[PDB]
Enzyme design. Structure first.
Site, PDB file in Angstrom:
ATOM      1  N   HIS A 207      -6.927   9.383  -0.488  1.00 55.57           N
ATOM      2  CA  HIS A 207      -7.580   9.255   0.824  1.00 55.57           C
ATOM      3  C   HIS A 207      -6.791   9.813   1.996  1.00 55.57           C
ATOM      4  CE1 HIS A 207      -5.439   5.374   0.230  1.00 55.57           C
ATOM      5  NE2 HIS A 207      -5.158   5.513   1.519  1.00 55.57           N
TER       6      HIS A 207
ATOM      7  N   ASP B 143      -8.079   0.976   1.623  1.00 57.01           N
ATOM      8  CA  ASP B 143      -7.881   1.977   2.664  1.00 57.01           C
ATOM      9  C   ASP B 143      -8.848   3.157   2.777  1.00 57.01           C
ATOM     10  OD1 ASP B 143      -4.958   3.813   4.016  1.00 57.01           O
ATOM     11  OD2 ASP B 143      -6.341   2.449   5.067  1.00 57.01           O
TER      12      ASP B 143
ATOM     13  N   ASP C  68       0.806   5.086  -0.186  1.00 55.82           N
ATOM     14  CA  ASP C  68       0.064   6.359  -0.095  1.00 55.82           C
ATOM     15  C   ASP C  68       0.762   7.486  -0.830  1.00 55.82           C
ATOM     16  OD1 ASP C  68      -2.191   5.634   1.577  1.00 55.82           O
ATOM     17  OD2 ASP C  68      -0.679   5.146   3.093  1.00 55.82           O
TER      18      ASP C  68
ATOM     19  N   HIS D 233       0.876  -1.200   0.000  1.00 54.60           N
ATOM     20  CA  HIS D 233       0.000   0.000   0.000  1.00 54.60           C
ATOM     21  C   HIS D 233       0.914   1.252   0.000  1.00 54.60           C
ATOM     22  CE1 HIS D 233      -3.583   2.329   0.678  1.00 54.60           C
ATOM     23  NE2 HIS D 233      -3.106   2.853   1.790  1.00 54.60           N
TER      24      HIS D 233
ATOM     25  N   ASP E  64       1.631  -1.453   4.429  1.00 51.04           N
ATOM     26  CA  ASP E  64       2.091  -0.130   3.947  1.00 51.04           C
ATOM     27  C   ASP E  64       3.542  -0.189   3.495  1.00 51.04           C
ATOM     28  OD1 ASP E  64      -0.408   0.595   4.814  1.00 51.04           O
ATOM     29  OD2 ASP E  64       0.287   2.251   6.092  1.00 51.04           O
TER      30      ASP E  64
HETATM   31  O1  BLT Z   1      -1.409   3.483  11.433  1.00 53.30           O
HETATM   32  S1  BLT Z   1      -0.221   2.683  11.200  1.00 53.30           S
HETATM   33  O2  BLT Z   1       0.984   3.502  11.104  1.00 53.30           O
HETATM   34  O3  BLT Z   1      -0.073   1.613  12.186  1.00 53.30           O
HETATM   35  O4  BLT Z   1      -0.357   1.857   9.904  1.00 53.30           O
HETATM   36  C1  BLT Z   1      -1.432   0.949   9.583  1.00 53.30           C
HETATM   37  C2  BLT Z   1      -0.972  -0.515   9.368  1.00 53.30           C
HETATM   38  O5  BLT Z   1       0.112  -0.515   8.428  1.00 53.30           O
HETATM   39  C3  BLT Z   1      -2.080   1.487   8.323  1.00 53.30           C
HETATM   40  O6  BLT Z   1      -3.261   0.654   8.066  1.00 53.30           O
HETATM   41  C4  BLT Z   1      -2.508   2.922   8.322  1.00 53.30           C
HETATM   42 SE1  BLT Z   1      -3.630   3.506   6.978  1.00 53.30          SE
HETATM   43  C5  BLT Z   1      -2.549   4.446   5.674  1.00 53.30           C
HETATM   44  C6  BLT Z   1      -3.037   5.911   5.447  1.00 53.30           C
HETATM   45  O7  BLT Z   1      -3.401   6.110   4.124  1.00 53.30           O
HETATM   46  C7  BLT Z   1      -4.283   6.037   6.372  1.00 53.30           C
HETATM   47  O8  BLT Z   1      -4.536   7.446   6.657  1.00 53.30           O
HETATM   48  C8  BLT Z   1      -4.090   5.282   7.689  1.00 53.30           C
HETATM   49  C9  BLT Z   1      -5.408   5.283   8.560  1.00 53.30           C
HETATM   50  O9  BLT Z   1      -5.059   4.563   9.789  1.00 53.30           O
HETATM   51 ZN    ZN Z   2      -3.695   4.657   2.608  1.00 56.74          ZN
END
Ligand code: BLT
Ligand code: ZN
Ligand code: NAG
Length: 1014
Positions: free
Chosen positions: A441, A174, A62, A60, A311
């Site tokens: 997102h 996500d 971002d 993933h 991630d």
């Molecule tokens: O929050 S962590 O740093 O633990 O990461 C976790 C697990 O890898 C991940 O799912 C975060 Se998601 C990645 C980002 O796009 C989103 O805002 C986060 C909402 O929580």
């Molecule tokens: Zn994300």
């Protein structure tokens, strides 16, 4: 055409109905904390019926979150992609899926040719598979459907050109809750399957118990089911490895081989992964296959999807090795032990869906039908993710401004073919890509770190400048005699004038038109109307004299009104918020009338005294202890008075009454009707002093909102023939109600200042007997019925308000349209409320690592429409949708796609023309040309122009239809040689159209057409 009003669809799962029945109890389910202890019959799978398992490696990535896009690219993603290329090239059975094309395009263009060829080969051979193929994985709550389509098209057009592939399976692991606008767009863009993950833990449990996690997702108004798209909802709390192999994360974590120590990662359940060996592979396989068979119990076929990723995974070469070699040892053992009756392998997302549908066609399973949405998401307990419907509202408003500027720039420049030296395609590609990136997102959602938000803002500012450049070059070409037109592609022939962005009180960005006998007597201005119908709208400009009159290019006088330029100031000496008037700049306002998708030119001329066709507004400042307010040459002196109730009426429009604090208290639609109570009020929510704290994602209020203490605010009343208004300086908000003859426009200049741990809400109180029902939109595309549920906490009853909301009873409706996405609800019968801004000191434990303390002034805009609806043909009480009236839809268009205004920069415009587009068809009011985009550069012998046509559905309330011409987009440009219906991305031709005519679409439908010109 299907009837979208009168036929309630029969679906197996209707999410509003499901919500009414569900109890949402948060009980400890054991190792699957939000489920139950899954049991399976070991005899279910045998030699003639094996469990087929697809382990799908993913990463993933971002496009900005805790680092900027470019920081992540340099530190992480370029390494992930380079090592994926090498490891897939060298290990033919290894697989990998990729979602975010913004990164892939950034990487691919930097590759040498030998590596580009290697990359194309691993894509063509099926090892690396693109999923969705959008520029980003967009937010689904705040995003406008037009921008979801824009970013999808940006990524897929790149993939078709460079990789020769178009994904038909979507991957959205996500976004914080999910919208049916996604399958709507995807199914009209060639897709066959989609996957989602962040849905409320209670919904996952309910659907898992009924094996309804895979379903045919259709729109809420679709009786026949032609919009349906097969959807897979993942069952567990996260897409990470501990929550994707099965129900017990303590076991699944042991199969994430990056967690043994040298990588700096571990298992929080305290049992680490162990390298697979011949001495432990049987016990390790016993444990893993048991997790897989439990997960398989939640679904209907014998094909199981096991995502393997997290991630920014698959970076290090050693990581690729440790995951691949350990899984290969498990597969070799498992697949050779007949007693497990499992065949496991690395796979892609499309391979999983193809196998599921093969099972379906073999009669092995039937899937349920579903309609509704998946908001508001909670990942645990009472932690509902409704905060991000409002976080970073400045940028949420900027999104809508840029949305419109991209549409207008692409449409204005589409009319001609441009020489490459004009850099039109270059600037439009930049603008499309920066707006597309912001749909991420962590972009529009307001959930990125402060410096990342700044990067998105800078990207969007550059995109706005690019759109302005393209727009003004296009206006000059469209309105200058051809044999005179002599373009300098770097020159600014016109300056855009935008009265609402950044907005008065936000940035002094507008240019004043400087006229004077000793410098310049007059100035040409041009309005553009991107909508496909004739439109009138009042427009304003700043001018250096109050003695200005307006003419059209036939020199016909146009009635105008001049008002002062008022700015509000927080007086740190007197401790009051009050307005100051300019003594050298004034506002001139007049009604512009512009052709469909066209331009209209007017002239502003100075005179030595009051012009015959220009009137002047009166101004009244209500406050105790007033001081003088001189206004230079303005001809009417400002009047003063103590605060008092007031009433105003512009034209034959509604009569509005205001309290002595400058806030609406009632609306009277016609001279004889009742003064309907409609009261605006500002309140504040706080943060809990114990327990979980609100942050960028979560809204965890410490109870119902408390009224903002108003003191005795200063109220300014401006009364004019064309426009009147009431403005009041309240703590943190300059609130303005503007009247032009129809539904009022509301503007709030919101500056939360240093008020930590505060969320400011704007509420409307009425006596409409709405009960527990209200309506909110999804992505500016459709209105969905909401039911307030007192069995859920306050924050669960907040929903995205991307463009509007309404409440109604049998007789009356109140609709609030917005120019920006914000969070809102109806917490009691007769109320509507919408959050304005939020300032939070604490992090909310979702990975961002900071609060929201970077607030800045933002100008929020709205239209407020009170209407009688007793004569309207509305859906029945069981239908899950609602629909706007004509007036509310036009009011939304006035906010999202206003007229554009251009001020000619030089002293004289030689060869100026008065209008463009007078012969364009003026289409029925419910039809829009959402996109007009030339698809070919000037070197192409056959030019192609793409159009996206959208028809909304407006209620029938007894207003005779009349007029309007049929709109055939294929004949808008001359010399048409072919007209084709295409997918919405323009990438696949679906129908060759008879007579080169593009038919209009049905209510709630969207189609795309491409015209080819010889
Ligand atoms: O929050 S962590 O740093 O633990 O990461 C976790 C697990 O890898 C991940 O799912 C975060 Se998601 C990645 C980002 O796009 C989103 O805002 C986060 C909402 O929580
Ligand atoms: Zn994300
Ligand atoms: C691209 O499309 C298909 C892929 O299946 C193939 O037949 C064709 O030869 C490919 N050509 C290109 C653009 O490389």
């Amino acid at each position: 055409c299907q009837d979208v009003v009168q036929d309630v669809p029969n679906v197996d799962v209707q999410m509003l109905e499901l919500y009414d029945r569900m109890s949402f109890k948060d009980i400890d389910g054991g190792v699957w904390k939000q489920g139950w202890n899954i049991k399976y019959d070991p005899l279910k799978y045998n030699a003639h019926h094996k469990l087929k398992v697809f382990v799908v490696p993913h990463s993933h990535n971002d496009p900005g979150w805790i680092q900027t896009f470019e920081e992540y690219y340099q530190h992480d993603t370029k390494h992930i992609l380079s090592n994926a290329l090498r490891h897939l090239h060298d290990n033919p059975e290894m697989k990998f899926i990729w979602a975010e094309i913004s990164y892939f395009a950034r990487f691919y263009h930097d590759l040498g040719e030998n590596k580009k060829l290697q990359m194309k080969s691993i894509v063509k051979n099926g090892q690396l598979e693109f999923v969705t193929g959008g520029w980003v994985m967009p937010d689904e709550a705040n995003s406008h459907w037009r921008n979801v389509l824009l970013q999808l098209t940006e990524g897929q057009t790149w993939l078709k050109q460079f990789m020769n592939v178009t994904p038909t399976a979507s991957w959205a692991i996500d976004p914080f809750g999910h919208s049916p606008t996604m399958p709507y767009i995807l199914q009209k863009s060639g897709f066959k399957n989609m996957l989602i993950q962040r849905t409320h833990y209670s919904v996952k449990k309910e659907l898992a118990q009924q094996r309804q996690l895979e379903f045919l997702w259709r729109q809420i108004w679709d009786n026949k089911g032609d919009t349906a798209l097969f959807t897979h909802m993942m069952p567990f709390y996260s897409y990470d490895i501990p929550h994707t192999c099965g129900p017990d994360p303590k076991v699944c974590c042991q199969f994430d081989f990056k967690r043994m120590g040298s990588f700096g990662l571990s298992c929080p359940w305290k049992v680490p992964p162990r390298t697979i060996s011949d001495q432990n592979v049987a016990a390790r396989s016993d444990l893993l296959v048991d997790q897989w068979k439990k997960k398989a119990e939640l679904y209907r076929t014998n094909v199981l999807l096991i995502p393997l990723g997290d991630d920014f995974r698959f970076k290090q070469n050693t990581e690729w090795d440790v995951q691949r070699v350990n899984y290969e040892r498990l597969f070799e053992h498992i697949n050779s032990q007949a007693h497990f009756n499992v065949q496991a392998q690395f796979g892609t997302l499309q391979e999983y869906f193809d196998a599921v549908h093969q099972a379906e066609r073999a009669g092995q399973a039937e899937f349920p039908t579903l309609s509704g949405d998946f908001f508001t998401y909670a990942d645990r307990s009472d932690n509902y993710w409704s905060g991000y419907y409002t976080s970073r509202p400045y940028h949420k408003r900027m999104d809508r401004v840029l949305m419109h500027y991209v549409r207008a720039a692409e449409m204005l420049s589409a009319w001609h073919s441009w020489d490459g030296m004009a850099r039109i395609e270059e600037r439009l590609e930049q603008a499309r890509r920066e707006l597309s990136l912001f749909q991420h997102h962590d972009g529009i959602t307001g959930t990125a770190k402060t410096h990342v938000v700044v990067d998105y803002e800078q990207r969007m500012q550059e995109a706005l400048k690019a759109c302005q450049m393209v727009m003004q070059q296009s206006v000059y070409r469209l309105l200058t005699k051809p044999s005179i037109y002599s373009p300098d592609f770097s020159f600014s022939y016109f300056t855009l004038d935008d009265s609402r962005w950044p907005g008065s009180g936000v940035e002094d960005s507008r240019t004043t038109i400087i006229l004077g006998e000793d410098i310049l007597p007059s100035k040409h201005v041009v309005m553009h109307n991107t909508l496909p119908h004739w439109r009138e709208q009042l427009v304003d400009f700043y001018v250096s004299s109050p003695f200005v009159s307006v003419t059209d290019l036939a020199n016909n006088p146009v009635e105008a009104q001049v008002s002062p330029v008022w700015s509000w100031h927080h007086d740190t000496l007197t401790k009051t918020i009050h307005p100051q008037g300019s003594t050298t700049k004034y506002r001139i306002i007049f009604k512009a009338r512009v052709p469909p998708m066209g331009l209209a030119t007017y002239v502003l001329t100075i005179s030595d005294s009051k012009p015959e066709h220009t009137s002047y507004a009166s101004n009244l400042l209500l406050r105790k202890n007033p001081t003088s307010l001189p206004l230079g040459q303005y001809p009417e002196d400002v009047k003063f008075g103590d605060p008092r109730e007031i009433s105003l009426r512009v034209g034959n429009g509604p009569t509005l009454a205001f309290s002595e604090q400058g806030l609406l208290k009632s609306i009277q639609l016609t001279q004889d009707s009742p003064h309907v109570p409609v009261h605006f009020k500002f309140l504040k929510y706080g943060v809990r002093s114990h327990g979980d704290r609100s942050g960028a994602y979560l809204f965890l209020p410490n109870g119902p909102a408390s009224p903002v203490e108003l003191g005795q605010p200063v109220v300014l009343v401006t009364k004019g023939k064309l426009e009147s208004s009431v403005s009041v300086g309240l703590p943190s908000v300059v609130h303005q109600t503007i009247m032009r003859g129809g539904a009022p426009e509301i503007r709030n200049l919101v500056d939360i200042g240093s008020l930590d741990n505060t969320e400011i809400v704007m509420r409307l109180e009425t006596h409409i007997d709405s009960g527990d029902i209200f309506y909110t939109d999804l992505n500016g595309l459709q209105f969905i019925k909401r039911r307030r549920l007192d069995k859920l906490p306050l924050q669960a009853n907040y929903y995205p308000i991307p463009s509007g909301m309404f409440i109604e009873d049998a007789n009356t409706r109140l609709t609030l349209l917005t120019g920006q996405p914000l969070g809102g609800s109806s917490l009691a019968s007769g109320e509507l409320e919408i959050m304005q801004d939020r300032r939070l000191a604490s992090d909310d434990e979702r990975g961002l690592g900071q609060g929201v303390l970077d607030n800045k002034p933002v100008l929020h805009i709205y239209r407020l429409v009170l209407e009688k609806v007793n004569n309207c043909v509305r859906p029945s009480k069981l239908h899950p949708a609602g629909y706007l009236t004509s007036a509310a839809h036009k009011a939304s268009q006035s906010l999202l796609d206003p007229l554009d205004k251009f001020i000619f920069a030089e002293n004289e415009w030689i060869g100026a023309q008065g209008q463009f587009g007078g012969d364009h068809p003026s289409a029925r009011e419910d039809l829009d040309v959402s996109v007009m985009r030339r698809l070919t550069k000037s070197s192409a012998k056959t030019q192609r122009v793409g159009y996206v046509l959208h028809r909304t559905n407006l209620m029938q309330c007894g207003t005779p239809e009349e007029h309007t011409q049929k709109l055939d987009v294929c004949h808008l440009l001359p010399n048409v040689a072919r007209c084709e219906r295409t997918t919405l991305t323009f990438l696949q031709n679906l129908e060759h159209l008879d007579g080169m005519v593009a038919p209009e679409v049905c209510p709630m439908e969207t189609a795309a057409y491409v015209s080819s010109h010889s």
